[PDB]
Design a protein around this ligand. Structure first.
Ligand code: HEM
Ligand code: EST
Length: 451
């Protein structure tokens, strides 16, 4: 592999155009490999998936979910069991339990209507507002209903703690990651360390919060009649797994859906405002198939080719998850002719797959018609090649869950309201990097619409 190069996610694409699809970088102490091409990634993660299905052993990882995290657990024989049930259980709720689709669809509807309420009221007359704090609230409330059944009221005190948990979490994860590349920072006092502690105590305070919900759920109506929410489904579905694994995976299912689905909606909104033509086409397609007397539902998703095309290309354009969770090699392997030793950290650049000019002819241009190939004038299945949920054995287990969720959100948001940009904000979607690519602070005006 090309020798370690010294110094965002765009920098990785700069070196791939010059030093090859695969190369090494020095991250302080640890050396790391980078995969940038769809060829180098599909090869490593799909073909040789079992070889790249590992995670680095980091300080940030273990405290999460009480050292039993699915997202940060090492590749092990018991981990494989943790995923199989985790993937199967979550798949059960999103699609397959006609009830869970309903129980989920009800929770998405409810919070989605609360969203247009607070969005319109906040834009009374000609007022503009920042939708970022509303998207995080809608995401946190919905996922609480999926994990714990109870969809709290926005003023509920316990719900205020969840919101307060996500904030500090996203604000201190940076320190938790700095220790992973600068482990000596813990050898003396400094602000990063003082923050790393706050991050580790957070995942303890929050795991106990979820462990409680588990106990109070377990010793409650146990005929097995129906899973109220994700918690029961995990209990019903239980090498051997310690019973403590059920709440450990739910702590990940919650923490995972937060920052991404929020950013997802933030992009879907700021895009409606910067491209009013496509917003119209989206708006036309809902009135034509669904009508004006009822709200959209999932059973219309097949009959809504453009709405999803807008979704799939919003994910491609933003690529708000530019780099996946760092992988580690399970054994020695070779990719593109290079030797790869074991226990080596390897990043996966999803941004390079979504902006490779050969694949996507005009990469930096927002055009949802890509996934609509007019010869059939129906949605084309190229979406599967959009890299945002990753690939292989560590791919997101909530892919088919967040697709329905987001589909129901923008379809309700666009079926009821008209999103206008702010004329003073200089257009030009400016990005805020780190975690996921959130669009830097913006404001929009949301008004109802008629037909
Ligand atoms: C827009 C929505 C989402 C995006 C873009 C997203 C993205 C990702 C990414 C980049 C990874 C790491 C893949 C890798 O390491 O190769 C991942 C893994 C994961 N996701 Fe998400 N995610 C989303 C929503 C969700 C949801 C809704 C859930 C749960 C219902 C979830 C749970 C997880 C878990 C548990 C993992 C770890 C899987 C593993 O390590 O084997 N995510 N996702
Ligand atoms: C790491 C990300 C933010 C933190 C998310 C998280 C946060 C906590 C957790 O226990 C699991 C996960 C898995 C999905 C993670 C996301 C995948 C991409 C995003 O950057």
């Amino acid at each position: 592999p090309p020798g370690p190069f010294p110094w965002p996610h765009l920098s990785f694409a700069r070196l791939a155009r010059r030093y090859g699809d695969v190369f090494q970088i020095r991250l302080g102490s640890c050396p790391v490999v980078v995969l940038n091409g769809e060829r180098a990634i599909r090869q490593a993660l799909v073909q040789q998936g079992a070889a790249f299905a590992g995670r680095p052993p980091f300080p940030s990882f273990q405290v999460v979910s009480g050292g039993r995290s699915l997202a940060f657990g090492r590749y092990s024989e018991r981990w494989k069991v943790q995923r199989r049930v985790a993937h199967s259980t979550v798949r059960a709720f999103s699609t397959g339990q006609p009830r869970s689709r309903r129980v989920l669809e009800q929770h998405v509807l409810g919070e989605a209507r609360e969203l247009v309420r607070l969005l319109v009221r906040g834009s009374a007359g000609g007022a503009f507002l920042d939708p970022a704090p509303l998207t995080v609230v809608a995401v946190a409330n919905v996922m609480s209903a999926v994990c714990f059944g109870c969809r709290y009221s926005h003023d509920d005190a316990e719900f205020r703690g969840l919101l307060s948990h996500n904030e500090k979490f996203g604000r201190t994860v940076g320190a938790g990651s700095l220790v992973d590349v600068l482990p000596w920072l813990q050898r003396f006092p400094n602000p990063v360390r003082t923050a790393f502690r706050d991050f580790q105590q957070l995942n303890r305070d929050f795991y106990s919060f979820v462990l409680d919900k588990f106990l109070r759920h377990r010793s409650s109506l146990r005929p097995g009649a129906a899973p109220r929410d994700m918690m029961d489904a995990f209990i019903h579905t239980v090498p051997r797994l310690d019973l403590e694994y059920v709440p450990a995976t739910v702590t990940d299912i919650f923490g995972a859906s937060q920052d991404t689905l929020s950013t997802a909606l933030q992009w879907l909104l700021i895009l409606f405002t910067r491209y009013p033509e496509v917003q119209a086409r989206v708006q036309e397609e809902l009135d034509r198939v669904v009508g004006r007397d009822r709200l959209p539902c999932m059973d219309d998703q097949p009959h809504l080719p453009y709405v999803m095309a807008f979704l799939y290309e919003a994910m491609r354009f933003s690529s708000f998850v530019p780099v996946t969770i760092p992988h580690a090699t399970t054994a020695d392997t070779s990719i593109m002719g290079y030797h790869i030793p074991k226990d080596t950290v390897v990043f996966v650049n999803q941004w390079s797959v979504n902006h490779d000019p050969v694949k996507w002819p005009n990469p930096e241009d927002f055009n949802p018609a890509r996934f609509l190939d007019k010869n059939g004038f129906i949605n084309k299945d190229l979406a599967s090649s959009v890299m945002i949920f990753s690939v292989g054995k560590r791919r997101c287990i909530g892919e088919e869950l967040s697709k329905m969720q987001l589909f129901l959100f923008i379809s309700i948001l666009a079926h009821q309201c008209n999103f206008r940009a702010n004329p003073d904000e200089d257009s030009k979607m400016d990005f805020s990097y780190g975690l996921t690519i959130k669009p830097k602070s913006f404001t929009i005006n949301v008004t109802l619409r008629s037909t």
